[PDB]
Amino acid sequence: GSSGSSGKIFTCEYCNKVFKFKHSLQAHLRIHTNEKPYKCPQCSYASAIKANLNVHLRKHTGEKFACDYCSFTCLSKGHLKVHIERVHKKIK
Ligand SMILES: [Zn+2]
Ligand SMILES: [Zn+2]
Ligand SMILES: [Zn+2]
């Protein structure tokens, strides 16, 4: 059986949210530090690389492709063919 008389719980000091593990709190605290340098001017997105921010910024002028079998959408017809082959067909 389990050791001790009680468990342990982890809590945010900035928004009072509660987490089951310390690693979940450490990953949550990233929103309160907001330390990623390359921030999007259009949305809440941020990056550690200017080239990776450029790979994000092109999505604000992108176009979606939609599934014929479900409600799914993605930003490439090649990615859509690979969605269909995995989710609606058998994998080759
Ligand atoms: Zn918080
Ligand atoms: Zn953005
Ligand atoms: Zn689909």
Q: How far is the CA of 31 from the centre of ligand 2 (A)?
A: 16
The domains of the chain are located at 9-35, 36-62, 63-89
Residue 60 CB partners (closer than 8 Å, separation 6+): 42, 43
- Known binding residue 56? Answer is yes
Query: According to the CATH classification, is domain 9-35 in 3.30.160.60?
Result: yes
First and final CA of the chain: distance in angstroms?
46
Distance, in Å, from the CA atom of 39 to the CA atom of 24, rounded to the nearest integer, reads 23
Which of 72, 30, 77, 38 has the alpha carbon at shortest distance from 55?
A: 38
User: So what CATH class is 63-89?
Assistant: alpha beta
Q: How far is the CA of 56 from the centre of ligand 1 (A)?
A: 25
Query: According to the CATH classification, is domain 36-62 in 3.30.1340.30?
Result: no
Question: What technique was this entry resolved by?
Answer: NMR
Structure tokens at 15: 């928004």
Whether 36-62 shares its CATH topology with 63-89 is answered yes
